[PDB]
Amino acid sequence: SVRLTPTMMLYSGRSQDGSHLLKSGRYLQQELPVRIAHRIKGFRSLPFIIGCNPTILHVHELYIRAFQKLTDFPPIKDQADEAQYCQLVRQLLDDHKDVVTLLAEGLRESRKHIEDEKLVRYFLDKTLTSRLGIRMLATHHLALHEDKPDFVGIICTRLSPKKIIEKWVDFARRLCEHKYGNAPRVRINGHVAARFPFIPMPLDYILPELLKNAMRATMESHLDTPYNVPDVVITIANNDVDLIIRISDRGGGIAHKDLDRVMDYHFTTAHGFGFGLPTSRAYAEYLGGSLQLQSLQGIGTDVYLRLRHIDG
Amino acid sequence: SVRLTPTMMLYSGRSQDGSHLLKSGRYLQQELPVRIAHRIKGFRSLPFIIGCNPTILHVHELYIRAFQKLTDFPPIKDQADEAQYCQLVRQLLDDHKDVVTLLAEGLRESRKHIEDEKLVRYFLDKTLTSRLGIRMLATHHLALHEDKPDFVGIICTRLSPKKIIEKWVDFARRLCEHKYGNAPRVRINGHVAARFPFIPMPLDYILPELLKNAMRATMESHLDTPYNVPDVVITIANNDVDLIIRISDRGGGIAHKDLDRVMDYHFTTAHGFGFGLPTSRAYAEYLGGSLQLQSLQGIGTDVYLRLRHIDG
Ligand SMILES: Nc1ncnc2c1ncn2[C@@H]1O[C@H](COP(=O)(O)OP(=O)(O)O)[C@@H](O)[C@H]1O
Ligand SMILES: Nc1ncnc2c1ncn2[C@@H]1O[C@H](COP(=O)(O)OP(=O)(O)O)[C@@H](O)[C@H]1O
Ligand SMILES: O=C(O)CCCc1ccccc1
Ligand SMILES: O=C(O)CCCc1ccccc1
Ligand SMILES: [K+]
Ligand SMILES: [K+]
Ligand SMILES: [Mg+2]
Ligand SMILES: [Mg+2]
């Protein structure tokens, strides 16, 4: 039993013997090295000047190491194997946890050099999303060893969009109060009672990115009245095709002169790395959804996150 | 006074004082470093795996050296400067004389690795033609120091297509007799008496390449009667727009299965490097002409070289 992801499946299975764990493990063992190989080919095809960057080189090496360890691992025959594969997966997850940051820093300068601006976008888009895919499958396998209720692996059986939004609201508010002394309140409307099966992992990246953006913009446009700023309003629309989360702020909007730039990696007006929007959009599209911006210059911004529903 | 080349001009000038030599020299001094820089940017943007190839790296270094020496050279103020610049130009010409071969060998293997097949074509096309441009301008400057009659620099004032074809016929025949014991005869028809101003340099590359192809094909398809093979027939058409040289052989033609490949760098059915056709076409197009093939599978091949006339 499965839940389709692009070109991949999140194994849904329940054998008491623990058989499903072996099927999963063998799947990963079949799937991971291939995808890592594609990422290594991506590094090999980078413009020479960029690929030679020490940080890019470092990540490049990590990916080779990862491929080495994965391929060196013996075919899984029993729980004892699988149990040990999990140790490797965990080590890999941890070794690669800073990869986005390293890529950002590695490319920040090196990218100025080449003529082809969209080449880096293509590379980052492809790399970050393949990576998300890899870490999802990996994390899902590990999660099958857990006995969390309302979870089949990383899949929440009854996810509440409101609850997960509130989780990331509290988080983003704190960051914001720390830097500004206050934070916009956030109201949530629409299908606030919706519950459905869903993988929270993408939400856990995207939502805090969008919230940080909205809060920062609200504060930086109300520097005279930090004690009194307009709410951020979030609207949940749940239908049979997709989930829509609209995040509306009164933070003055995105300027016409920045509009063409904000979806570029490394672009920022400063929370300062410039990856939030491009990464979030790439993630959404990778999962079959989208991320769209509506700027009302001089008033604020509406951001629309759409994510497809799990088939089944 | 000038003769236009793409984005560049072949200085036509005649001062007795030797003033025109300074204008030329200063032009080169202005023009060469820029074009070398573009080629260096081309090397920097090569796929990392290819750019790391030791031979590619070597050529890459040559180009940097070339840029260093050119930029380090002091602005030209007098004949004594110019005279010394010429020494540098000559050294560069000679240091870079094997560059095409080095690139061919450097890429032969490295190119298999990347996904994008047309990326190397674009690189070679751009590099080889920029290089041709550079060596033409350079050689032209040096040639302005000569007192050859019917030559203004590298420009023959009264070039005879028949004479230059015959030059390369004798050359290609010898190569061919050496390898096979005989060589097709060659007949030349059409405007055999034409004479007009023209830069022979491109002809000196293209013609021997096309002739070698035609002769090899004729022999390899007449292995039973090497002592008696069908002529190669060359037709000259001279009009006001362009010069057309048609090289028809009865060498059995280019097979349908090879047709899509023959214009690819490194493709060969063996005179064995696989650069003749792609280089020749790139050269022709760079100069505003073209190179077109008509295959009659089972009979032979017609090759059409078109080169624009010098405006003025
Ligand atoms: N809700 C918003 N309101 C106003 N401006 C925004 C909003 N979201 C993003 N921006 C602008 O787009 C830029 C890119 O955002 P992002 O990709 O998250 O990078 P960062 O937040 O690190 O600057 C921000 O620097 C900011 O100028
Ligand atoms: N006149 C011709 N007749 C038949 N085949 C030809 C002719 N010219 C070229 N070819 C084919 O096209 C291929 C590519 O030619 P070229 O680029 O000159 O490389 P090379 O001669 O080094 O093989 C040759 O290997 C040969 O198969
Ligand atoms: O996270 C990344 O940067 C890419 C994936 C590293 C990894 C491989 C296999 C399993 C788990 C993690
Ligand atoms: O020939 C090449 O490979 C490229 C040109 C080297 C050169 C530079 C300046 C002048 C003369 C020659
Ligand atoms: K950005
Ligand atoms: K070829
Ligand atoms: Mg941000
Ligand atoms: Mg040839």
Curated annotation (Swiss-Prot), chains A, B:
Binding site for K(+): 262, 264, 267, 274
Top EC class of this enzyme: transferase
Activity: how regulated: The ATP-ase activity is up-regulated by potassium and rubidium ions but not by sodium ions. Up-regulated in the presence of apo- or lipoylated-DBT/E2b subunit of the BCKDH complex.
Ligand binding (ATP): 213, 249, 268-269, 271, 274, 277
Positions with a binding annotation for Mg(2+): 213
Reaction catalyzed: L-seryl-[3-methyl-2-oxobutanoate dehydrogenase] + ATP = O-phospho-L-seryl-[3-methyl-2-oxobutanoate dehydrogenase] + ADP + H(+); L-seryl-[protein] + ATP = O-phospho-L-seryl-[protein] + ADP + H(+)
GO cellular component terms listed in the entry, alphabetical order: mitochondrial matrix; mitochondrion; oxoglutarate dehydrogenase complex
Main location: mitochondrion
N6-acetyllysine: residues bearing it: 126, 167
Subunit structure: Homodimer. Homotetramer. Dimerizes through interaction of two opposing nucleotide-binding domains. Interacts with E2 component of the branched-chain alpha-ketoacid dehydrogenase (BCKDH) complex. Competes with BCKDK for binding to the E2 component; this interaction is modulated by branched-chain alpha-keto acids. At steady state, BCKDH holoenzyme contains BCKDK and BCKDHA is phosphorylated. In response to high levels of branched-chain alpha-keto acids, the inhibitory BCKDK is replaced by activating PPM1K leading to BCKDHA dephosphorylation and BCAA degradation.
Function, in words: Serine/threonine-protein kinase component of macronutrients metabolism. Forms a functional kinase and phosphatase pair with PPM1K, serving as a metabolic regulatory node that coordinates branched-chain amino acids (BCAAs) with glucose and lipid metabolism via two distinct phosphoprotein targets: mitochondrial BCKDHA subunit of the branched-chain alpha-ketoacid dehydrogenase (BCKDH) complex and cytosolic ACLY, a lipogenic enzyme of Krebs cycle.
Protein name: Branched-chain alpha-ketoacid dehydrogenase kinase
UniProt source species: Rattus norvegicus
Lineage: Eukaryota, Metazoa, Chordata, Craniata, Vertebrata
Range of the intact protein held here: 67 to 405 of 412
